């Protein structure tokens, strides 16, 4: 039927949710960074929580990267047919859109980490 595509859109919403979870973790990382920097004697528990957040981000990102690569490989396999279709184009659009959102969140995270490392170094 249209099982392949209806299942594809469900996979799109899954990836979107993951990207949104990364975004949410990135904001919490920013909060922990501030708390650690504003504290006269930082709490080890807080540092541990920051570590788990970073770990969670890295893990969810690999899931996103992996699912997006899979979608792209599928698109290219289809293109090896030297032919196009409405579904192929729909999939190509969702892949570039999800990719854009993913790149934006990871870029924000990398900038947040670089900034924190700079402040920790410039410190004590």
Curated annotation (Swiss-Prot):
Residues 43-84 form a coiled coil. The chain holds residues 26 to 149 of 288 of the full protein. Expressed predominantly in cerebral cortex, hippocampus, cerebellum, adrenal medulla and retina with weak expression detected in non-neuronal tissues. Phosphorylated by CK2. Belongs to the syntaxin family. This is Syntaxin-1A. Plays an essential role in hormone and neurotransmitter calcium-dependent exocytosis and endocytosis. Part of the SNARE (Soluble NSF Attachment Receptor) complex composed of SNAP25, STX1A and VAMP2 which mediates the fusion of synaptic vesicles with the presynaptic plasma membrane. STX1A and SNAP25 are localized on the plasma membrane while VAMP2 resides in synaptic vesicles. The pairing of the three SNAREs from the N-terminal SNARE motifs to the C-terminal anchors leads to the formation of the SNARE complex, which brings membranes into close proximity and results in final fusion. It comes from Rattus norvegicus. It is found in: Cytoplasmic vesicle, Secretory vesicle, Synaptic vesicle membrane; Cell membrane; Synapse, Synaptosome. Part of the SNARE core complex containing SNAP25, VAMP2 and STX1A; this complex constitutes the basic catalytic machinery of the complex neurotransmitter release apparatus. The SNARE complex interacts with CPLX1. Interacts with STXBP1. The interaction with STXBP1 promotes assembly of the SNARE complex. Interacts (via C-terminus) with KCNB1 (via C-terminus); the interaction increases in a calcium-dependent manner and induces a pore-independent enhancement of exocytosis in neuroendocrine cells, chromaffin cells, pancreatic beta cells and from the soma of dorsal root ganglia (DRG) neurons. The modification Phosphoserine is found at residues 39, 70.
